[PDB]
Amino acid sequence: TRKTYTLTDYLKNTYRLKLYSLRWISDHEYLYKQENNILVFNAEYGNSSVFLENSTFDEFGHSINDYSISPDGQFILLEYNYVKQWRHSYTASYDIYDLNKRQLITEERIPNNTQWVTWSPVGHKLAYVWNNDIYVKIEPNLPSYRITWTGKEDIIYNGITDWVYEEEVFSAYSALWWSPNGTFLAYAQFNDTEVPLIEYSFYSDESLQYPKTVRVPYPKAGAVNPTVKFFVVNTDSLSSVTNATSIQITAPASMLIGDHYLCDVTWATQERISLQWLRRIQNYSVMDICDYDESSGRWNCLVARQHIEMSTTGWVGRFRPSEPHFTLDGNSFYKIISNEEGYRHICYFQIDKKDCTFITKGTWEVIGIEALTSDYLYYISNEYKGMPGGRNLYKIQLSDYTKVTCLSCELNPERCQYYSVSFSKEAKYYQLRCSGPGLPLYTLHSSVNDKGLRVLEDNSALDKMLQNVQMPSKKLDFIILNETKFWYQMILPPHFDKSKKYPLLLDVYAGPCSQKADTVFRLNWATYLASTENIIVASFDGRGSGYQGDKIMHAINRRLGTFEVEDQIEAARQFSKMGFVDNKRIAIWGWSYGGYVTSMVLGSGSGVFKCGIAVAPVSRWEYYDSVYTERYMGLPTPEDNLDHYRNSTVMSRAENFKQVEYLLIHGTADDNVHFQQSAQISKALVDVGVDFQAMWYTDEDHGIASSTAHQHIYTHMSHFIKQCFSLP
Amino acid sequence: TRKTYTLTDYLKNTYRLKLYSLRWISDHEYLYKQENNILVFNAEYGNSSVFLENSTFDEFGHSINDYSISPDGQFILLEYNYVKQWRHSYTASYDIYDLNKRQLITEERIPNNTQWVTWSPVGHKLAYVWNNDIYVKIEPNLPSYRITWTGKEDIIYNGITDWVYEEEVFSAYSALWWSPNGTFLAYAQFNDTEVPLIEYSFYSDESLQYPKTVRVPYPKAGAVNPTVKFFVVNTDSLSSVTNATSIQITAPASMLIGDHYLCDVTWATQERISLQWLRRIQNYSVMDICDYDESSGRWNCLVARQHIEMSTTGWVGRFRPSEPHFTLDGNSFYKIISNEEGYRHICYFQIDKKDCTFITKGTWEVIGIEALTSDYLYYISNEYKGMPGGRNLYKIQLSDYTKVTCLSCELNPERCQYYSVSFSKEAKYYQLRCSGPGLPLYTLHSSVNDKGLRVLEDNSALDKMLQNVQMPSKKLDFIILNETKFWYQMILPPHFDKSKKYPLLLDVYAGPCSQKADTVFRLNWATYLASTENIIVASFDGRGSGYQGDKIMHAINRRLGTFEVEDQIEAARQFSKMGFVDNKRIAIWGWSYGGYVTSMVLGSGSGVFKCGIAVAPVSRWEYYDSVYTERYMGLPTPEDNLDHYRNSTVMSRAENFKQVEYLLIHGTADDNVHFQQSAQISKALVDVGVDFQAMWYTDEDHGIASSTAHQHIYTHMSHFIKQCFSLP
Ligand SMILES: C[C@@H]1c2nc(C(F)(F)F)nn2CCN1C(=O)C[C@H](N)Cc1cc(F)c(F)cc1F
Ligand SMILES: C[C@@H]1c2nc(C(F)(F)F)nn2CCN1C(=O)C[C@H](N)Cc1cc(F)c(F)cc1F
Ligand SMILES: *[C@@H]1O[C@H](CO)[C@@H](O[C@@H]2O[C@H](CO)[C@@H](O)[C@H](O)[C@H]2NC(C)=O)[C@H](O)[C@H]1NC(C)=O
Ligand SMILES: *[C@@H]1O[C@H](CO)[C@@H](O[C@@H]2O[C@H](CO)[C@@H](O)[C@H](O)[C@H]2NC(C)=O)[C@H](O)[C@H]1NC(C)=O
Ligand SMILES: *[C@@H]1O[C@H](CO)[C@@H](O[C@@H]2O[C@H](CO)[C@@H](O)[C@H](O)[C@H]2NC(C)=O)[C@H](O)[C@H]1NC(C)=O
Ligand SMILES: *[C@@H]1O[C@H](CO)[C@@H](O[C@@H]2O[C@H](CO)[C@@H](O)[C@H](O)[C@H]2NC(C)=O)[C@H](O)[C@H]1NC(C)=O
Ligand SMILES: *[C@@H]1O[C@H](CO)[C@@H](O[C@@H]2O[C@H](CO)[C@@H](O)[C@H](O)[C@H]2NC(C)=O)[C@H](O)[C@H]1NC(C)=O
Ligand SMILES: *[C@@H]1O[C@H](CO)[C@@H](O[C@@H]2O[C@H](CO)[C@@H](O)[C@H](O)[C@H]2NC(C)=O)[C@H](O)[C@H]1NC(C)=O
Ligand SMILES: *[C@@H]1O[C@H](CO)[C@@H](O[C@@H]2O[C@H](CO)[C@@H](O)[C@H](O)[C@H]2NC(C)=O)[C@H](O)[C@H]1NC(C)=O
Ligand SMILES: *[C@@H]1O[C@H](CO)[C@@H](O[C@H]2O[C@H](CO)[C@@H](O)[C@H](O)[C@H]2NC(C)=O)[C@H](O)[C@H]1NC(C)=O
Ligand SMILES: *[C@@H]1O[C@H](CO)[C@@H](O[C@H]2O[C@H](CO)[C@@H](O)[C@H](O)[C@H]2NC(C)=O)[C@H](O)[C@H]1NC(C)=O
Ligand SMILES: *[C@@H]1O[C@H](CO)[C@@H](O)[C@H](O)[C@H]1NC(C)=O
Ligand SMILES: *[C@@H]1O[C@H](CO)[C@@H](O)[C@H](O)[C@H]1NC(C)=O
Ligand SMILES: *[C@@H]1O[C@H](CO)[C@@H](O)[C@H](O)[C@H]1NC(C)=O
Ligand SMILES: *[C@@H]1O[C@H](CO)[C@@H](O)[C@H](O)[C@H]1NC(C)=O
Ligand code: NA
């Protein structure tokens, strides 16, 4: 009898997925770390040399967290003293190593506690943010030029995002954008002066006598938002003038009438930048296209070049308006937008014409535009086999839109249905990354003939390991509700028997534009539950889920906590009808949005679920941030949508938790979904006399991802599920 | 078959203890509220009259929290808009009703948000504190005189205590002391300028969008403490034109050399006040005796009237140096102090003589001095039958100390072994309050020949109800450890069978000077556990416990988390060897100090306990307040006691929790034992990979006493204990 995949296997990572993370440094060369040596690979032939020997920084005196080679290959940026902040933000120390001289640079050093640093895209200029101000070094050993003087901790942010712009808009800490050859540096400035603070305790090591109060500018739904300004400085003039002018590009009049956001910055050419702005009511966006005027040194945005993107059924974009991809000359661009049918497709614009031309169409969606050459556009879509949860690379001929080639579809169709891609600098080569339904497979290809060059990593080591393990299987399929297909997946125990009744766990996220049913291979908690505990772990994509058109995605518009919640309940009813599910043993669990949905389902009075686990749930939309919440809910005012805000809380359903077993879990240092949200759930439950299980995680944030806490939470949850299902 | 005492009975107060709370107004009369009417009773005959009808305030408009009748019976102070702060502190609104003209005073009213108010001991003057300043009204309808002008929230406290003085020194919010005829008002001023703040979140009602941060000046062990000054003002020479002059009485030079406390204020006569000061190192205290100088208007404390009280084995006093009881002329006084054997007895002092004379002696302790006449001193002691957990009233003839008469011992020896007493103004009458081992019994007596006048309340209604319930019994006994007896109690199930094996729960407090084994009748959680669940609930008084001399009490000096923890394990080990205890089912629980000891026990590696519950435990002495902690521990500095502070933490024992079941519970708004303490426990257990059970109570303090939270906590603990013991 082969062993099963156990909780320890999962928690100790005994069965390891191999990756192949390369970094393109030119059109035909990439860097790859092998045995802590940095190797440089010729893409065409596969041969390598040592770029930087593992022993180079033995006497550095610090553990190096990451590195970054300048585009011209002359310098390497060494990152150490890494200190995490939020999802993307952190601070660090930096040294620069001169690759030609083979010397560490010791003068005019990047200061300690630096917030962000980046090379120019050409050469070896550096821009960094320190104490909320921007600085530029033209040469690594020379003095910095200060760009901004207004930086103020928790108040003014120059070239870095505040909490909400980092999480909800840019998915980055950085708010700086070099122009393509590095002449200009564009940046955003955020003003949080009147933004209210979330305040919570951080306990730290036990040696800390008094807990620390962490205070973060965080706008909750309907609260005062940060304001934003945009500037461009000419870095080439820095060594010529005492104090180079940052030229402001003001938002259009249509944004200035009320609260708004900067949502996209994309350079088109050396002297043309595009900016997208979004109204606080997130169904109206404007793209300005701005040209440098040589004789005035100003930036002007012609109204003839201004592009409106709006929605009548929901918000604009999946999570924000999509980025443009400009042709080399900067006179036209490609952009994913929702078509007349509500499906997201590639539209082609001339910069000074308002109507675009759709170059793709159909009842499927383009996920992203990956590369653009003079002859071809490359994109990922879920077109293949009508499967919204698959992903493949396509190539469309720019001079003939009827010529569309799927580059990945038929490579290994049994093993590989979910792809991402990595193109070299001028798209001469691409790495394909297959992530499922079989073991991940990494391969290299030449764009000139789309021929496979070689297999990079095929995970044969893991395959060999998994032969001696009773592994679960995955079913991906659909049910039909109101003449619409809704997709689900099931992690099924080994030797699955259709004539037996299995306990079922519903794994839920269900946020807007989410997808929990897909072709990705995962080794996770569900793997253990199916493999060792013989539990079916199911997930379902109902109304509000993504990549299936706006009719489904915008169904929850202004109504979170309704259809996406009901559809999970209905999914569980449908899984019962299938005949291999023990109706007396159906559980539900989720993290984040999934914790909200789980709690809403457990408080619905449906009778379907015996028990459930919510980890770091939202409990009331007014507690969550403005940008995310208002996108789907509008404003919590009597004029707008307050009634539904107040109607969609977990707390109002407290009495119904008498029918279920509930485990509530939250990290105390969660800056994202505040511990407040679960403090309010537990209080409401105490107030109606409902017994439940609770667990706080001291100083853990939204990820509860520290090594010991991760192991602890999954161990705690396993006991709870096993208890609920009467499993020994 | 009759019912048992259930969890619902405990939580819903089905079986109510009747009380008889009287208020002496003279040597011959008392007030007693009956049916919301206030009656006045003649003590000699038992006849009464209505003092104030219930319906007098029918149209008042506010719900009245409490009342306070002026000593002359002319006025009644009406308390409403009560808002709790800490254990003793609150604010309220106040109105004064004139009892003779049957009218609310509407002029010059006491302000809203008043922090403290008190009648003078004679007549009807008022002193109140509002916004941290002291005010005086000579007549209820006249303008107040402002006494102090320095009051400042969280910084300067006039006539009220700060957090630590309220909790640990005075057990009161008031820091005001009227002289016996109301001429003078003495008061303390506290300065918290450099005291660090504990900060924690308060979530409030669901409607509060952002949690509030509560900030309280709170000195943890070793931190900067509040400073204190003491003043006396003449309320007979106040002026509308001139600001009042307060005369400062400075601490003795022996105190001024370093950090110190004011720990007692007691008026001796109309013109003589005593104060006791205590060093931050709490084994040295000094009493000053100060006389008013009529020609100079100053208060002089003659060095010849200083009395030093120190300890070579521990700290001074049980929780602080004891209060003196001055004779009529104030030329001599009686004070409980530790004798040369280390037993607390009454010493007789002359004001200007160094040596006092002990008037009581033996291997038992005086609990308190209760009344004093020229012929007798009346006191409570645990002398009778050599039982440290019994209490009886005695009088001692002041002219012949060999003549000691027990006044309560033989009244009802089977029902009544635990008394407290309330004397009338000149000790002409006394009320005895028996609280166990039988049902509470309240009686009135006259001092002249100790006649038992009448039974006030015998709880015969409860007795009749309890006849149809299967009530548990209590065993009080002792075990021997190193030739010393230590007492324990067991709450035994109904129909106890010493040939059956019962699970056992060890209920623990074990703080210094605590007593958990006594003759008191209680209806609590243990009653339910024994009556319904057939669990023996044991408590044990080991080293560090009170009322048995300093050899026992001071055993844990500088050494908390040692002998008192060991002695609980040893008691349980001994119980586990008794024929009627199931050694496979022994549990431990406690709250506060008992939560600390429970955790230290479960982390001891003893193997004796299967499971345990800690509620709001201390986890590290450096997190608790200075006044309590340093009393027993000294300072957490390398030159003093840091090493033991560091080795007496719960966190260091985390690994030893692997073999026990542990439930950790804490209120998030605990201002006393900060949530921090439990937050650090859970983190330590997570860090070593130990699974446990947790519950936080949102916005609950140290008492977890809100109605809903109280029902929830005991419900949750009941399930935990029953699960642990395999009980259905
Ligand atoms: C993962 C998702 C996302 N997906 C994508 C896509 F489509 F590009 F893949 N872009 N983004 C932008 C970032 N995303 C977010 O949903 C951000 C959001 N703050 C996540 C979140 C939602 C919650 F309801 C919550 F309670 C906690 C959270 F962290
Ligand atoms: C109850 C006790 C006490 N008992 C007495 C006595 F002897 F008069 F009964 N006086 N005092 C003075 C006040 N007392 C205290 O112990 C105060 C103390 N802060 C209580 C306490 C101790 C802890 F270890 C703790 F963790 C939390 C607490 F609230
Ligand atoms: C991979 O091999 C190629 C081709 O052999 C190397 O390119 C050059 O090879 C010729 C001799 O065969 C010489 O001109 C030089 O020795 C090489 N020049 C370069 C580009 O370095 C190439 O070096 C190899 N790539 C790596 C990264 O090792
Ligand atoms: C950030 O925004 C705030 C507005 O909240 C600006 O602060 C105001 O500045 C003016 C000067 O123009 C003052 O007269 C006001 O008193 C300020 N108001 C507040 C609320 O402080 C601030 O100038 C902005 N900062 C930057 C660098 O743009
Ligand atoms: C460089 O130029 C900027 C912009 O002109 C200066 O910033 C101004 O500084 C003055 C006085 O310190 C303030 O009154 C303005 O409000 C600032 N404006 C902005 C946009 O920040 C900056 O101080 C200059 N630096 C130097 C070294 O002269
Ligand atoms: C990168 O692009 C910038 C912007 O076009 C170039 O700067 C211009 O250079 C031209 C010469 O072709 C001059 O006419 C302008 O005066 C420059 N404009 C500005 C705003 O500086 C720059 O030379 C390019 N860099 C490189 C190295 O090619
Ligand atoms: C305490 O509060 C009461 C009630 O607010 C005060 O009496 C008045 O109350 C009404 C509303 O109840 C208000 O319109 C007035 O502002 C209050 N003032 C007066 C003088 O009528 C009362 O004054 C307050 N007491 C103190 C000492 O401020
Ligand atoms: C309360 O005691 C005070 C202090 O002894 C009395 O005040 C004194 O009264 C006598 C009058 O016989 C004067 O000689 C003193 O000058 C007063 N001394 C002070 C300190 O003011 C007061 O008479 C007593 N009050 C009552 C109500 O009995
Ligand atoms: C009160 O207690 C302190 C601390 O135990 C005693 O001061 C001395 O301090 C250190 C320990 O911190 C040691 O060197 C001595 O053991 C302590 N003194 C002795 C016994 O010599 C202090 O003596 C105590 N005071 C009284 C009144 O006994
Ligand atoms: C209790 O009884 C006494 C005596 O029977 C009551 O009578 C005394 O006080 C009354 C006025 O307050 C008058 O009736 C008499 O002055 C006086 N009589 C005596 C006994 O000398 C007394 O009021 C009663 N006490 C109460 C509180 O009602
Ligand atoms: C309360 O105590 C503080 C000291 O903590 C007093 O202010 C003093 O301390 C300051 C340092 O924080 C010094 O700068 C001041 O010079 C010093 N003042 C005096 C009078 O010495 C403060 O006055 C105290 N308040 C009261 C009303 O007693
Ligand atoms: C580089 O150092 C590593 C140590 O981590 C060593 O294992 C490796 O063999 C070294 N590289 C080579 C080419 O030997
Ligand atoms: C960073 O901090 C270290 C330690 O304090 C210091 O020695 C070093 O000089 C700092 N580096 C810079 C660039 O200031
Ligand atoms: C944006 O949303 C609001 C609220 O639903 C609506 O009233 C308005 O018409 C919308 N605007 C557009 C461009 O559809
Ligand atoms: C009393 O003292 C305060 C503050 O010191 C002052 O403002 C007030 O005017 C004084 N009153 C008189 C009458 O002296
Ligand atoms: Na009698």
Query: Per-residue DSSP letters for A543-612?
Result: TT-SSS-HHHHGGGTT-TTSHHHHHHHHHHHHHHHTSSEEEEEEEEEEETHHHHHHHHHHTTT-S--SEE
Alpha-helical segments (H) within B208-327: 253-256
Chain A positions touching B217 (Cβ under 8 A) are none
Distance between CA B52 and CA B728 in Å, rounded? 53
Angle formed by the axes of helices B593-602 and B563-575, nearest 10°: 70
The yes-or-no answer to whether B1-13+468-728 and B17-459 have a common fold is: no
Chain B positions touching A689 (Cβ under 8 A) are 708, 711-712, 715
Distance between CA B162 and CA A89 in Å, rounded? 42
Alpha-helical segments (H) within A428-540: 460-466, 525-531
Q: How many CB atoms lie within 10 A of CB A312?
A: 7
Chain A positions touching B199 (Cβ under 8 A) are 201, 210-211, 213
For B277-293, give the secondary structure using H, E and C. EEECCCCEEEEEEEEEE
C-alpha distances in Å from residue A604, one per residue of A91, A509, A596, A619, A683: 44, 17, 12, 14, 18
Taking an 8 Å cut-off on Cβ atoms, the answer to whether B676 and A715 are in contact is: no
Q: Which of A218, A161, A167 is nearest to A187 (CA)?
A: A161
Closest Cβ opposite residue B682 in set A209, A213, A698 = A698
φ and ψ at A410, to 5 degrees? -100, 10
> Which DSSP state fits B637?
S
A536 is written with which tokens? 């079916």
CB contact set of A31 (below 8 Å; sequence gap of 6+): A22, A23, A25, A38, A39, A40, A41, A51, A69
Query: Per-residue DSSP letters for A610-657?
Result: SEEEEES----GGGSBHHHHHHHH--SSTTTTHHHHHHS-SGGGGGGG
Give the helix/strand (H/E) hosting B508.
strand B502-508
Give the helix/strand (H/E) hosting B318.
none
> Which DSSP state fits A257?
T
CATH architecture of A1-13+468-728: 3-Layer(aba) Sandwich (3.40)
Q: Yes or no: say if B472 and B5 are a contact pair by the CB < 8 Å rule.
A: yes
Distance between CA A326 and CA B718 in Å, rounded? 68
Starting from the edge strand earliest in sequence, which strands make up the sheet with A37-42, in order? A22-24, A29-34, A37-42, A48-52
Distance between CA B402 and CA B207 in Å, rounded? 69
Q: Look at strands A661-667 and A581-591 and give their pairing.
A: unpaired
A380 is written with which tokens? 């990922």
For B532-557, give the secondary structure using H, E and C. CCCCEEEEECCCCCCCCCHHHHHHHC
Nearest CA-CA distance, residue A111 and chain B, Å: 33
Closest Cβ opposite residue A679 in set B203, B651, B684 = B203
Q: Which of B610, B490, B581, B583 is nearest to B538 (CA)?
A: B490
Alpha-helical segments (H) within B126-282: 163-165, 253-256
Angle formed by the axes of helices B707-724 and A676-687, nearest 10°: 90
Distance between CA B110 and CA B131 in Å, rounded? 12
CB of A312 shorter than 6 A to ligand 14: yes
When computed from its CA atoms, the radius of gyration of chain B, rounded to whole angstroms, is 26
Sketch the domain layout of chain B as residue ranges.
1-13+468-728, 17-459
Give the helix/strand (H/E) hosting B47.
none
Chain A positions touching B684 (Cβ under 8 A) are 206
Q: Yes or no: say if B543 and B567 are a contact pair by the CB < 8 Å rule.
A: yes
C-alpha of A259 from chain center: 25
Alpha-helical segments (H) within A253-303: 253-256
Q: Kindly tell me the burial class for residue A182, based on how many C-beta atoms sit within 10 Å of its own C-beta (0-12, 13-18, 19 or more).
A: buried
Taking an 8 Å cut-off on Cβ atoms, the answer to whether B199 and A206 are in contact is: no
C-alpha of A125 from chain center: 28
C-alpha distances in Å from residue A355, one per residue of A289, A304, A305, A334, A347: 16, 12, 11, 12, 9
Please, which experimental method was used?
Answer: X-ray
CB contact set of B134 (below 8 Å; sequence gap of 6+): B127, B128, B146, B147, B148, B158, B159, B176, B185, B187
Taking an 8 Å cut-off on Cβ atoms, the answer to whether A211 and B680 are in contact is: no
> Which DSSP state fits A46?
-
Residues forming beta bridges with residue A186, ordered by sequence position: A177, A232
Q: Is A714 helix (H, G, I), strand (E, B) or coil?
A: helix
CB of B271 shorter than 6 A to ligand 8: yes
A127 is written with which tokens? 């821009």
Place of tokens 């999962």: A10
Q: Is A365 helix (H, G, I), strand (E, B) or coil?
A: coil
Q: Which of B598, B601, B629, B593 is nearest to B515 (CA)?
A: B593
Q: Is B706 helix (H, G, I), strand (E, B) or coil?
A: coil
If you measure from the C-alpha of residue A120 to the centroid of ligand 3, how many angstroms do you get, rounded to a whole number? 28
A477 is written with which tokens? 């399929």
C-alpha of A148 from chain center: 30
Nearest CA-CA distance, residue A614 and chain B, Å: 15
Q: Yes or no: say if B603 and B653 are a contact pair by the CB < 8 Å rule.
A: yes
Angle formed by the axes of helices A707-724 and B675-687, nearest 10°: 90
Query: Per-residue DSSP letters for B362-426?
Result: SSS-EEEEEEE-SSEEEEEES-GGG-TT-BEEEEEETT-TT-EEESSTTTSTTTEEEEEEEE-TT
C-alpha of B666 from chain center: 22
Check the CA dihedral B61-B67-B73-B75 and report its sign: negative
E strands in A171-226: 176-178, 184-191, 197-202, 212-217
Query: Per-residue DSSP letters for A375-410?
Result: SEEEEEES-GGG-TT-BEEEEEETTEEEEEEESSTT
Q: Yes or no: say if A367 and A389 are a contact pair by the CB < 8 Å rule.
A: no
A94 is written with which tokens? 């930096």
Q: Which of A254, A87, A78, A105 is nearest to A166 (CA)?
A: A87
* Exposure class string for A2-33: b at 16+ Cβ within 10 A, else e: eebbbbebbbeeebeeeebebebbeebbbbbe
Say whether the peptide bond before residue A388 is cis (omega within 30 degrees of 0): no
Give the distance between the most distant pair of CA atoms in chain A.
Answer: 81
Q: Yes or no: say if A668 and A709 are a contact pair by the CB < 8 Å rule.
A: no
Distance between CA A660 and CA A603 in Å, rounded? 8
Place of tokens 């979530």: B203
A275 is written with which tokens? 């900016």
CB of B85 shorter than 6 A to ligand 9: no
Residues forming beta bridges with residue B299, ordered by sequence position: B292
Give the torsion through C-alpha atoms of B380, B381, B383, B386, to 10 deg.
120
The set of protein residues with a Cβ atom below 6 angstroms from ligand 15 is B 149, 243
Distance between CA A311 and CA A557 in Å, rounded? 11
Give the torsion through C-alpha atoms of B543, B547, B548, B553, to 10 deg.
30
Give the helix/strand (H/E) hosting A490.
strand A484-492
Q: Look at strands A441-446 and A451-457 and give their pairing.
A: antiparallel
Distance between CA B332 and CA B357 in Å, rounded? 11
Give the helix/strand (H/E) hosting B263.
strand B260-269
Distance between CA B547 and CA B683 in Å, rounded? 38
Distance between CA A641 and CA B468 in Å, rounded? 58
Q: Yes or no: say if A144 and A96 are a contact pair by the CB < 8 Å rule.
A: no
Distance between CA B179 and CA B195 in Å, rounded? 31
> Which DSSP state fits A196?
P
Assigned fold of B17-459: Methanol Dehydrogenase; Chain A (2.140.10)
Mutate to test the pocket of ligand 4, among A132, A187, A193 (most ligand atoms within 8 A of CB): A193
CB contact set of B135 (below 8 Å; sequence gap of 6+): B127, B128, B129, B144, B145, B146, B147
Interface of A with B in 210-239 (CB under 8 A): 210-211, 213, 220, 223
C-alpha distances in Å from residue B620, one per residue of B32, B205, B260, B626, B680: 46, 32, 24, 13, 9
Query: Per-residue DSSP letters for A311-328?
Result: -SSS-SSSSSPPPPEE-T
Q: Yes or no: say if A372 and A329 are a contact pair by the CB < 8 Å rule.
A: no
Place of tokens 């000691």: B404
Q: Which of A169, A297, A162, A282 is nearest to A231 (CA)?
A: A297
A386 is written with which tokens? 């009508």
| Upper half-sphere CA count for residue B10 (Cβ side, 13 Å) | 23
Distance between CA A461 and CA A459 in Å, rounded? 5
Check the CA dihedral A618-A624-A628-A633 and report its sign: positive
C-alpha distances in Å from residue A716, one per residue of A29, A406, B608, B650, B692: 47, 45, 25, 21, 8
Distance between CA B254 and CA B273 in Å, rounded? 19
Distance between CA A673 and CA B288 in Å, rounded? 58
Distance between CA A156 and CA A133 in Å, rounded? 9
Q: Which of B257, B316, B314, B252 is nearest to B284 (CA)?
A: B316
Distance between CA A281 and CA A296 in Å, rounded? 35
Distance between CA B200 and CA A297 in Å, rounded? 52
In angstroms, this model's resolution equals: 2.3
> Which DSSP state fits A521?
-
φ and ψ at A643, to 5 degrees? -60, -45
A155 is written with which tokens? 């108040």
A167 is written with which tokens? 């999480």
Query: Per-residue DSSP letters for B108-164?
Result: SPPPTTEEEEEE-SSTT-EEEEETTEEEEESSTTSPPEE--S--BTTTEEESB--HH
B551 is written with which tokens? 């050899």
Distance between CA B650 and CA B617 in Å, rounded? 10
Q: Yes or no: say if B396 and B409 are a contact pair by the CB < 8 Å rule.
A: no
Interface of B with A in 54-93 (CB under 8 A): none
Residues in chain A: 728
Q: Which of A316, A313, A324 is nearest to A282 (CA)?
A: A316
Nearest CA-CA distance, residue A620 and chain B, Å: 9
CB contact set of B294 (below 8 Å; sequence gap of 6+): B271
Place of tokens 């509220």: B33
B643 inside 8 A of chain A by CB: no
Q: Which of A586, A493, A551 is nearest to A363 (CA)?
A: A551
Check the CA dihedral B525-B530-B534-B537 and report its sign: positive
- Give me the total of CB pairs closer than 8 Å, taking one residue from chain A and one from chain B: 120
CB contact set of A454 (below 8 Å; sequence gap of 6+): A46, A443, A444
Q: Is B205 helix (H, G, I), strand (E, B) or coil?
A: coil
Residue type, B205: D
Ligand 14 nearest-atom number relative to CA A310: 13
Distance between CA B42 and CA B169 in Å, rounded? 37
Distance between CA B554 and CA B532 in Å, rounded? 39
CB of B293 shorter than 6 A to ligand 8: no
A349 is written with which tokens? 């614009």
B36 is written with which tokens? 């919301």
Distance between CA B345 and CA A49 in Å, rounded? 90
Distance between CA B682 and CA A490 in Å, rounded? 35
Residue type, A101: K
A404 is written with which tokens? 């569309």
Angle formed by the axes of helices A563-577 and A593-602, nearest 10°: 70
Q: Kindly tell me the burial class for residue A174, based on how many C-beta atoms sit within 10 Å of its own C-beta (0-12, 13-18, 19 or more).
A: buried
When computed from its CA atoms, the radius of gyration of chain A, rounded to whole angstroms, is 26
Give the helix/strand (H/E) hosting B451.
strand B451-457
* Exposure class string for B35-69: b at 16+ Cβ within 10 A, else e: eeebbbbebeeeebeebbeeeebeeeeeeeeebbb
